[PDB]
């Protein structure tokens, strides 16, 4: 929560418990706020597995060993 | 002497006439050949008409 | 416990809150069903009626 | 992130328990990022607020609560005591009230006769001074949004929920009586408040022990079921990447019934098996491969038997109904080979039942065809820390009260056929009562039960009174018997545990050989006991064996390596003088050193009795003689032993006249 | 011996019923009214979307002498898209590859065909058969239908979009692989994309991959909207059953039809709030959202009919609903009782203390306010919403126990109280009770013409309650005379002209919420009284309403009644003076209650009515017209005898619903006489405070999703029951070739119970679906409702049944099963039992056409019901009788029905088995459909099947048969030396569709059955100019296509539509 | 007895009980007609001689 932490730093700055300058509890509804997130990768997917692990599994799906 | 007395029930409620438990209460079935269904009816309707009172 | 079920469905009696016990009343289904106040009092009183009484 | 579990969490003890590992979540690094939030106070406020409102309003308020946004109440004195608190120390007054009433609070005059202070105080209301002011009758939905928006919230009542409740005034003014979060917060009571709030999958709503958490989760699944975020234990582990007894980890297995009898694989039935303990599965080495549950004569392999007796009943997967296997080897269906597939939930239960309060005998009630001698032989061969768990020497079989009578009860009820008009033979009676299907007719059972009830009420009950009184006199024992009204008509002191085996008893009746009379007569007699008993829903058999066996394994894991001298204990009766020192064992205790050094200074000198010592020493090796002890005052509570130590349940009294002894503690 | 009774006892233990409701229901019925379990609609699938897996059966001869081991890709540990084997078959397993968010407790899991699977075909109804390996041939069809229903209920998910990655290997031309979550995600990528592997060998796998087309790998489309956010939907080239692709696509289309935006939610909540509560919604480019809430009006009407049919003639299941609306309106309504209006009155008028009678203390002993009046008044006000099912009447204890007496001021006050309290009840016989109360008061003073001598003038007014029992003098006012009765004439005229008029308020909204009323026009409320909206928001006392006019007319009659001396000569001037004094003062008492009931309470009921679990169910309030009083209302759930139209079946096959409530009169009249406002209130602030905590729940939004599944389940039930029994609905029949039971009502009800249990254990709804239809015969069910007035005219509502995606998918799955029956474990046609001894390597699941004979084959004896066997004597051959009545020896080609052998098995075994084994007797047993097993043998060595065949012929019982044992050879790589093999059971049609590939890690298959990789499945790989979206669905299943995936989010309502004021 | 043993028709009072649900009530001074007819019928597993 970035607006909550900004309001908390605003309250911590000048000797208060409640802040006069808030970033949450605005009267304006914006339910479509999309900040950047680590859940999304670059190319339109999730980041449940990291990309290096994905590429490693992709190239380890085909290996070839020596004959006996 | 007096507390060692205990009733004998020659025709008990048969074991098929009870349902499974709700918590620790079993329900007497509707299709019951025993005489206890009239007690069940009377105390049911009495409990419902008691709890429906605003008193 | 069956007759008080309708007209007092969620509200509690004096001091005794609502609760939940699971039921197996239909042989095919098994679920947890919410319990009102007076039903809960019957649930607690039934343990004592099943056990019998000890006298000091 | 927020994750919700079905357990009471705290910031203090839930990490020492290892709660997420106890659900199966693998967080083995201990990188201490999973910050906890104590929920003791919100569970207790839930308990207090279910008194006043409807549970619908209560739960639907409590759901929409951001547990990340810190907030706290501060409740007030009443309206005619708040001005009195404003009178003394007038500096603590907020600037909102009135400049006309502030000047009238701050002065030194006694204000006895109030001509305009009366008007200024009556026209005063709290609602224009303190801005939320929830109410006394607030419809508690709005409490949660008031605590989500702000961080301090004024109120005038007690029945609130969501945060801790701080006092505004000192304690003499009333008439009713920050937290570290590190982005992976877990704790009960889910929220629909924010994205990134999650609910733990796994355990069923049916098997939650707290019943208030269970009520809450039943409502939060009956509404909002589409918008939850159910994640498995493995997904939780991937997102991450005074030891107590009587709390077992517990799972359910998912086996099935298979035959290979023609050299071909073929799956027949589909089963599930509930609440098997994890420690016994780690003991037996149970894994996924094919198992066989018969050995060499048709008898079960003594570990599958312990597994089925240790837990509750089976359940079919197709029909969702109770299932009872065939103990006989004669198939309409038999089970020869199985195959175990997976485990489904990882909750924890209290092994200790609610009915167990005081140290007193245990009365178990089984039907006739339970595996009595076999389960006794299996529990005989257990000895965990040098002490035997349940010895044979003080367990009472069902027919031991029946065999001591001189008309020898089974032989007495063989002679029932002469009173009936038209049977006049025992074999003709056993033919006549049955259908030639072995389900009997109801009218023959009714007539025979009217003939049978005077034999069981008159010629059994006072002999049973004398027998159970004698067995209570000679120690603290465990009595297997039948038809629980045999323990109710005869006034039996001690605990009563109506139990039920997970197997079919009535086919187990007619398999055994050289029993009393014909086997058909034993089955008819079993039906008469079953008709005789009650309508009470018994239990499954698993709870008593879980209580007997499973606490000692945690103690074997804990104190399997320390010394017997400093980790053993013993309690019993003690008489001061010496004539032809006296001590009788009452209970033995295994515990660690700190627990026993807590046990020593407790007030064991409160309870007293009468102790009677006779002079018939018996086959045992040390110089100890049989005795009798009869408790007189109150009984020993189990809290006065412990929650943490592990004691033996039932024992005998072995060390003349009465002595009037008092019991005490001894150890090394 | 006694040893055989154990099997009988355990069989009677196995014959217990599965589902049976013996206990009672009302505790669950009232909970089903107040709070329904929402179903689990949205479920995400992060795996891959198939249901057909490819299992190897026998391992390949990887070290062999004819070819070095360096040829095979087995020796290099190369992970193959297809399992290398000597013989590979494809079997069906739902969700073997899918990572599920929430499972359905539901599967269709089958073994490979070398293992038995008869339990899945004996699991449904076969509670009778003794053997573990037997299933009744007459009950295959119900098994197959429940299996198809189970398959569809498995595959109702949504494909979730997870996490691409680009390869760095030169296998594909920079294609975009998909990663799927799991503990071991490394082995999947060989199975997923079969065209990624190189082509070393002239194996069949490598031949197929070299025949494939390169560019169709992985991602080829995406829908990006926001920078640095997830893509919305993609299209991927992955291995996937086109069947379950089509099923999940239709489920996604259903939910996309239910999708709504928050702007329409804002407009719906504002219109329901009537402006008293505002809500806000963002105005910005959203990411995307999926909120399945909107349904049409037909689903709301059908759910409401089923719910009214649920609550029938019971009066203790509707009581908590009205109590709930009373306690809910308790917090909304501004007026409380003023405790002292009554006692502050009656001090303006007084009397002499010399009298012993006192009208004021008669009032204060007659009516007792006590605040227990207040909840009963609120229940009486809430009962206006539900007059079709509940008719609130007045209790008999409020009546004067005698019929009253005019000479008693006690009974005069009783008449006053009843004449005030009667207009607020929804009883249509309130005016005739108000008239007959006065006619019971005036007995001996004035006489009126009654109807007969039973319902006389002195009969109690309570007993009427019926339009047949209205007296004729109240209908025809000419009959009562002004000289004979001047009081009752004008009191009749007061009732005829001044009784309150009905009106309406227009609650609700039909945009988002479906309209849920039935006989009234859509979204309207009906009220017994008038309504006029208030002009100001600071309300004050006025007398221009309707109920004070009614009170004035009643009090004017009581003025004229107490004024005349001949009615009561017992009173002197003082007592009568105090009487008309308190009369006129009570005429002009002030109260907020009647103007409140005009101005504010209908606005309140219009606010309440959307947020309500049982939405309003109304019949029209007729005022005084005798010809329009509703005498009944009824629902149907079954067509009657033979007729099909519900408009013809509904007249005589209805179940009448409706109860009385029996409130009292004291409560209504004290709350009517005394009511205050707060001393300072403004209505916009007051209602805007009180209504705002109500609109923070989604209970009705879960209720609409509940109302989806009920209509879905009833349409699926009629579609499935119509397959086994003849119904009225024009259903399509695909499974006539499977044998079925000559089904009855018990079988249909049982099958419906099994379908109900499946429909509950999927979607996890724990209470009460489809049981209000199960108590009767479900083979002729329908749904309608009607009421009827007095004059004989009926009005009915027959709602149309909407579409149903699960019923559509079950019909499509049966259409697919008609061709791909071999994958679910079924062979068509019939078998031919006859000895065949040769070294040929053909498979008995696809025999040559020489051995097979039909009914049209010449010289073939057809046997039927006309079958007896006579022995032979002195060397004569034993003979059996033809259907045409001819004697034949035990030779040649025969044709049996299965039922003949099945009903006469043991007598036919002993006579026939020695002739089948050696002699030239070939028997064709017709059964249509049968499950099968497979036994493989080495063709190097000798092989005989008489043990398996004679075991099967022994195990055929009159109740059940076991699976038919076939014996096919093993396909081999190199040339082999032949060996004699003896077979007995062959099929009649091609049944090698379950076969996939023979010697798939080998250059060629010389001996045995040969089949390459089926190129007609992978049309997208093998055809260059075929479009990407092309399914050959009714013939094949294609095992590979483009499947779409979604990354929508499902937030709650209150996290989008906030409404913070 | 021989008709009872031949006959396929078994008698099951759940057909009446699930339809009627005995303890419905209306006009609570006395009994309801549904409770009256089920107290008069007693649908139960007994003989049908």
Automatic annotation (TrEMBL), chain A:
It is found in: Virion. It comes from the Viruses. Residues 1-18 have a biased composition (Basic and acidic residues). Residues 21-50 have a biased composition (Polar residues). Inner capsid protein that self-assembles to form an icosahedral capsid with a T=2 symmetry, which consists of 120 copies of VP2, with channels at each of its five-fold vertices. This capsid constitutes the innermost concentric layer of the viral mature particle. This is Lambda-1 protein. It comes from Mammalian orthoreovirus 3.
Automatic annotation (TrEMBL), chain B:
It is found in: Virion. Belongs to the reoviridae RNA-directed RNA polymerase family. This is RNA-directed RNA polymerase. It comes from Mammalian orthoreovirus 3. The chain holds residues 387 to 441 of 1267 of the full protein.
Automatic annotation (TrEMBL), chain D:
InterPro entries: Reovirus_Mu2. It is found in: Host cytoplasm, Host cytoskeleton; Virion. One of its GO terms (molecular function) is structural molecule activity. Its main location: host cell. Keywords: Capsid protein, Host cytoplasm, Host cytoskeleton, Virion. GO terms for cellular component: host cytoskeleton; viral capsid. It comes from the Viruses. This is Mu-2 protein. It comes from Mammalian orthoreovirus 3.
């Amino acid at each position: 929560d970035e607006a909550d932490d900004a309001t908390k730093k605003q309250a911590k700055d000048t000797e208060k418990a409640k802040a006069q300058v808030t970033y949450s509890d605005t009267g304006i509804n914006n339910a479509n706020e999309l900040s950047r997130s680590g859940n999304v990768d670059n190319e339109g997917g999730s980041n449940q597995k990291p990309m290096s692990t994905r590429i490693a599994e992709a190239t380890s799906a085909i290996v070839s060993k020596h004959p006996a | 002497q007096e507390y060692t007395q205990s009733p004998e029930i020659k025709v008990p409620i048969p074991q098929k006439d009870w349902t499974g438990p709700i918590g620790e209460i079993r329900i007497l079935k509707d299709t019951t050949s025993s005489i206890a269904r009239y007690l069940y009816r009377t105390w049911y309707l009495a409990a419902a008409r008691m709890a429906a009172q605003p008193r | 416990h069956e007759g008080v079920a309708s007209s007092s469905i969620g509200k509690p009696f004096m001091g005794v809150p609502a609760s939940i016990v699971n039921d197996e009343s239909v042989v095919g289904v098994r679920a947890a069903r919410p319990i009102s106040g007076m039903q809960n009092m019957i649930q607690h009183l039934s343990k004592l009626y099943k056990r019998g009484f000890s006298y000091r | 992130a927020y994750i919700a579990v079905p357990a009471v969490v705290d910031s203090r003890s839930s990490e020492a328990i290892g709660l997420l590992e106890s659900f199966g979540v693998d967080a083995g690094s201990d990188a201490n990022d999973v910050s906890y939030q104590d929920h003791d106070y919100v569970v207790d406020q839930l308990q207090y607020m279910l008194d006043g409102y409807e549970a619908g309003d209560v739960i639907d308020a409590l759901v929409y609560r951001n547990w990340l946004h810190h907030s706290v109440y501060c409740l007030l004195p009443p309206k005619s005591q708040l001005l009195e608190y404003w009178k003394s120390n007038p500096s603590v007054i907020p600037d909102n009230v009135d400049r006309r009433l502030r000047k009238r609070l701050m002065l030194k005059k006694d204000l006895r006769k109030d001509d305009e202070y009366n008007q200024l105080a009556r026209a005063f209301k709290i609602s224009d001074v303190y801005a939320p002011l929830i109410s006394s009758t607030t419809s508690p939905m709005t409490m949660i949004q008031n605590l989500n928006q702000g961080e301090i919230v004024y109120t005038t009542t007690d029945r609130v929920i969501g945060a801790r409740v701080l006092l505004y005034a000192p304690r003499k003014y009333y008439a009713s009586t920050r937290v570290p979060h590190s982005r992976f917060n877990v704790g009960t009571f889910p929220s629909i408040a924010t994205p990134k709030c999650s609910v733990m999958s796994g355990v069923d709503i049916e098997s939650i022990p707290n019943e208030f958490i269970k009520l809450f989760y039943q409502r939060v699944k009956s509404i909002h079921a589409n918008i939850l975020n159910d994640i498995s234990p493995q997904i939780v582990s991937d997102m991450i990447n005074h030891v107590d007894v009587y709390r077992v980890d517990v799972v359910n297995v998912l086996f099935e019934v298979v035959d290979v009898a023609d050299g071909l694989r073929s799956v027949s039935r589909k089963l599930i098996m509930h609440t098997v303990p994890v420690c016994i599965l780690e003991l037996l080495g149970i894994e996924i491969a094919d198992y066989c549950i018969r050995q060499e004569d048709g008898m079960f392999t003594d570990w599958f038997l312990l597994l089925t007796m240790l837990s509750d009943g089976l359940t079919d997967r197709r029909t969702h109904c109770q299932y009872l296997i065939n103990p006989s080897s004669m198939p309409p269906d038999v089970i020869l080979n199985i195959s175990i597939t997976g485990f489904i939930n990882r909750h924890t239960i209290d092994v200790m039942p609610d009915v167990y309060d005081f140290i007193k005998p245990i009365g178990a009630v089984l039907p006739k065809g339970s595996f009595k001698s076999t389960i006794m032989r299996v529990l005989d061969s257990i000895s965990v820390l040098g002490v035997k768990i349940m010895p044979r020497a003080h367990v009472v079989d069902s027919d031991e009260v029946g065999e001591q009578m001189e008309p020898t009860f089974e032989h007495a009820v063989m002679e029932i056929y002469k009173g009936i008009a038209g049977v006049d033979s025992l074999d003709d009676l056993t033919k006549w009562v049955l259908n030639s299907d072995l389900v009997p007719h109801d009218d023959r059972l009714g007539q025979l039960f009217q003939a049978f009830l005077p034999l069981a009420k008159d010629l059994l009950a006072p002999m049973a009174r004398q027998f159970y009184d004698n067995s209570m006199s000679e120690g603290r024992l465990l009595t297997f018997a039948h038809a629980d009204s045999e323990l109710l008509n005869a006034n039996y002191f001690g605990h009563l545990l109506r139990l039920k085996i997970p197997y079919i008893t009535e086919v187990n009746l007619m398999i055994r050989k050289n029993r009393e009379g014909g086997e058909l007569f034993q089955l008819v007699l079993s039906y008469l006991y079953k008709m005789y008993a009650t309508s009470a829903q018994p239990k499954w058999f698993g709870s008593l064996l879980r209580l007997l066996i499973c606490p000692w394994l945690h103690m074997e894991k804990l104190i399997g390596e320390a010394d017997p001298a400093s980790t053993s204990a013993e309690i019993g009766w003690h008489v001061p003088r010496e004539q032809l020192d006296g001590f009788i064992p009452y209970v033995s205790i295994r515990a660690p050193r700190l627990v026993i050094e807590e046990l020593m200074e407790k007030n064991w000198g409160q309870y007293h009795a009468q102790v009677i010592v006779t002079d018939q020493l018996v086959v045992g090796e040390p110089r100890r003689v049989s005795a009798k002890a009869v408790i007189k005052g109150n009984h020993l509570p189990v809290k006065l032993i412990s929650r943490f130590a592990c004691f033996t349940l039932t024992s005998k009294y072995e060390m003349g006249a009465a002595y009037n002894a008092r019991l005490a503690f001894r150890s090394d | 011996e006694i040893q055989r009774h154990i099997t009988e006892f355990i069989s009677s233990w196995q014959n217990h019923p599965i589902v049976q409701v013996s206990a009672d229901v009302e505790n669950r019925k009232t909970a089903q009214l107040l709070h329904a379990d929402t179903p689990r609609l949205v479920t995400w699938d992060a795996g891959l979307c198939t249901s057909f897996k490819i299992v190897p059966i026998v391992p390949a001869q990887v070290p062999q002498d004819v070819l070095a081991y360096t040829f095979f890709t087995s020796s290099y540990a190369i992970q193959s898209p297809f399992p290398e084997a000597a013989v590979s078959r494809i079997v069906v397993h739902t969700r073997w590859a899918s990572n599920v968010d929430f499972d359905r407790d539901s599967s269709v899991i089958m073994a490979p065909p070398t293992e038995n699977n008869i339990h899945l075909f004996k699991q449904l109804l076969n509670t009778e058969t003794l053997s573990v390996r037997g299933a009744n041939p007459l009950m295959f069809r119900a098994n197959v239908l429940h299996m198809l229903l189970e398959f569809v209920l498995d595959n109702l998910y949504l494909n979730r979009h997870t996490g691409f990655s680009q390869d760095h290997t030169p296998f594909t031309e920079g294609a975009n692989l998909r990663s799927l979550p799991g503990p071991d995600a490394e082995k999947w990528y060989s199975i997923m994309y079969p065209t990624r592997m190189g082509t070393p060998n002239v194996s069949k796998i490598c031949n197929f991959v070299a025949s494939c087309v390169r560019n169709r790998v992985g991602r080829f489309d995406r829908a990006q909207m926001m920078n640095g956010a997830m893509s919305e939907w993609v299209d991927v080239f992955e291995t996937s059953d086109a069947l379950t692709v089509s099923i999940r696509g239709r489920w996604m289309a259903r939910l996309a039809r239910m999708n709504i935006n928050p702007t329409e939610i804002e407009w719906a909540l504002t219109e329901c709030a009537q402006g008293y509560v505002t809500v806000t919604s963002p105005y910005a480019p959203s990411v995307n959202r999926l909120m399945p809430y909107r349904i049409s009006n037909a689903e709301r009407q059908i759910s409401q009919i089923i719910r009214v049919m649920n609550i029938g003639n019971n009066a203790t299941v509707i009581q908590p609903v009205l109590q709930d609306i009373s306690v809910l309106l308790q917090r909304i309504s501004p007026l409380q009782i003023d405790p002292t209006i009554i006692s502050n009155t009656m001090s303006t008028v007084s009397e002499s203390t010399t009298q012993t009678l006192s009208p004021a203390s008669s009032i204060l002993g007659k009516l007792r306010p006590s605040n227990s009046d207040f909840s009963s008044f609120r229940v009486a006000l809430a009962g206006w919403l539900y007059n079709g099912v509940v008719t609130t009447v007045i209790d008999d204890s409020s009546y004067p126990k005698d019929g009253g007496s005019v000479t008693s001021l006690e009974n005069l006050w009783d008449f006053f109280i009843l004449a005030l309290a009667l207009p607020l009840t929804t009883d249509p016989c309130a005016p005739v009770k108000a008239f007959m109360t006065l006619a019971n008061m005036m007995v001996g003073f004035e006489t009126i013409p009654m109807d007969n001598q039973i319902y006389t003038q002195s009969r109690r007014a309570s007993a009427f309650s019926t339009p047949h029992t209205w007296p004729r003098c109240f209908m025809n006012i000419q009959l009562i005379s002004p000289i004979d009765a001047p009081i009752l004439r004008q009191w009749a005229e007061i009732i005829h002209r001044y009784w309150p008029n009905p009106s309406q308020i227009r609650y609700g909204t039909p945009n988002v919420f479906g309209s849920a009323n039935l006989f009234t026009p859509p979204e309207v409320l009906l009220l017994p009284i008038d309504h006029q909206p208030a002009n100001v928001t600071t309300p004050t006392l006025d007398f221009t309403n309707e109920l004070t006019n009614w009170r004035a007319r009643v009090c004017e009659l009581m003025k004229n009644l107490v004024d005349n001396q001949r009615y009561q000569p017992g009173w002197t001037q003082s007592l009568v003076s105090s009487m008309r004094g308190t009369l006129g003062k009570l005429k002009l008492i002030k109260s907020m209650t009647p103007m409140y009931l005009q101005q504010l309470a209908p606005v309140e009921l219009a606010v309440i009515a959307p947020m309500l679990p049982f939405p309003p169910f109304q019949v029209p309030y007729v005022r005084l017209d005798r010809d329009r009083v509703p005498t009944m209302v009824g629902v149907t759930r079954q067509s009657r005898d033979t007729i099909t139209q519900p408009a013809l079946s509904l007249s005589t096959t209805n179940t009448t619903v409706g109860v009385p409530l029996a409130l009292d009169a004291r409560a209504i009249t004290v709350a009517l006489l005394s009511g205050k406002y707060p001393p300072d209130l403004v209505t916009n602030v007051w209602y805007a405070d009180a209504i705002y905590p109500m609109y923070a729940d989604t209970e009705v939004f879960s209720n609409l999703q509940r109302d989806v599944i009920t209509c879905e389940a009833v349409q699926t039930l009629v579609t499935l029951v119509a397959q086994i029994s003849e119904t009225q609905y024009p259903v399509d029949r695909y499974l006539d070739w499977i044998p079925s039971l000559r089904a009855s009502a018990a079988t249909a009800a049982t099958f419906a119970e099994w379908v109900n249990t499946s429909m509950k254990t999927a979607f996890d709804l724990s209470d009460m679906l489809l049981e209000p239809l199960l108590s009767g015969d479900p083979r002729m069910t329908q749904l309608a409702i009607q009421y009827q007035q007095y004059n004989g005219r009926t009005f009915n509502v027959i709602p149309e049944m909407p579409g149903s995606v699960i019923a559509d998918c079950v019909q499509l799955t049966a259409e697919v099963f008609n061709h791909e029956y071999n994958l679910f474990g079924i062979a068509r046609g019939d078998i031919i039992i006859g000895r065949v001894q040769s070294t040929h390597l053909w498979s008995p699941l696809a025999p040559p056409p020489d051995l097979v004979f039909d009914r049209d084959t010449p010289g073939v004896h057809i046997f039927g019901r006309d079958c007896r066997i006579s022995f032979g004597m002195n060397g004569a051959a034993p003979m059996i009788r033809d259907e045409t009545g001819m004697m034949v020896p035990f030779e040649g080609n025969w044709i049996f029905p299965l039922a003949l052998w099945q009903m006469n098995t043991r007598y036919f075994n002993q006579q026939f088995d020695a002739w089948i084994k050696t002699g030239e007797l070939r028997i064709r047993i017709e059964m249509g459909a049968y499950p099968y097993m497979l036994h493989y043998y080495d063709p190097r060595q000798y092989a005989n099947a008489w043990n398996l065949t004679s075991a099967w012929l022994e195990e055929i019982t009159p109740t059940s048969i076991p699976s038919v044992p076939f014996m096919v050879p093993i396909s081999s790589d190199h040339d082999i030396s032949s060996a004699p093999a003896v077979q007995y059971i062959i099929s009649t049609e091609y049944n090698d569709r379950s076969l996939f590939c023979t010697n798939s890690s080998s250059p060629q298959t010389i001996a045995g059955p040969d089949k390459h990789i089926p190129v007609e499945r992978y049309n997208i790989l093998t055809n260059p100019d075929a479009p990407p979206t092309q399914i050959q669905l009714p013939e094949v299943v294609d095992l590979y296509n483009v499947v779409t995936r979604y990354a929508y989010e499902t937030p709650p309502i209150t996290a989008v539509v906030m409404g913070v004021p």
